[PDB]
């Protein structure tokens, strides 16, 4: 396995990341109390406790969002997937940044993602589970959205609306993309043979 393309053309990493992002997003929504705790049930993933919503439409929304993220991952068009927490005025208060690098060549010397996927991804999940300790209290009535930072260069004349797998997406406006000099809180970094991923939170200063 010399190359990224050897792992089913990026499909393996995309699938593993989408499975991971779904569980991480649910856990974020729980620990930050974006939704009432009563919709979340306790499950196990990566042999560690996780908290997953049983609300059908919220579930489907998260899945639909990640269904759009998957092809972007496969074509190596993702630098970040960000869970953005918005206050009641719709201003970012907090961002959970999953910064992803998929180099074209596998790093020979790093540990095998696929042999240790449980342990490696569990470590992120465990940091999310207890992150409420290190973050500020969010104001009441927060919502979330998901921002995808792509590898694509912006062109002068580009349509704001971009349809992906039949769902309309939009170029993110400065209200969401910009936080004024946020405080950066590191949670976890991993370098594996196939994937480099860093999780950190940006909080409003």
């Amino acid at each position: 396995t010399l190359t990224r393309q050897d792992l089913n053309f990026g499909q393996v990493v995309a699938d593993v990341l989408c499975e991971f992002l779904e569980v991480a997003v649910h856990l974020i929504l729980y620990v930050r109390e974006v939704y009432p705790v009563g919709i979340f049930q306790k499950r196990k993933k990566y042999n560690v406790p996780v908290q997953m919503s049983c609300h059908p439409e919220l579930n489907q929304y998260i899945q639909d969002t990640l269904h759009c993220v998957k092809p972007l991952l496969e074509k190596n068009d993702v630098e970040k997937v960000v869970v953005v927490i918005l206050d009641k005025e719709h201003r970012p208060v907090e961002k959970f940044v999953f910064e992803i690098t998929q180099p074209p060549l596998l790093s020979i010397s790093s540990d095998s993602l696929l042999s240790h996927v449980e342990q490696l991804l569990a470590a992120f999940i465990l940091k999310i589970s207890v992150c409420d300790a290190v973050l500020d209290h969010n104001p009441p009535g927060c919502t979330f959205t998901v921002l995808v930072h792509t590898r694509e260069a912006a062109t002068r004349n580009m349509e704001k609306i971009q349809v992906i797998k039949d769902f309309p997406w939009i170029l993110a406006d400065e209200q969401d993309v910009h936080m004024h000099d946020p405080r950066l809180i590191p949670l976890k970094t991993m370098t594996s043979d196939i994937l480099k991923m860093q999780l950190y939170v940006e909080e409003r200063a």
Partner: peptide
Amino acid sequence: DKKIVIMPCKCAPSRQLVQVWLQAK
């Protein structure tokens, strides 16, 4: 050079819609 950053046009279900579903059982 700036890259394309995108978000869904539609919001996730509101907290209140979920509260109502929960309270209904």
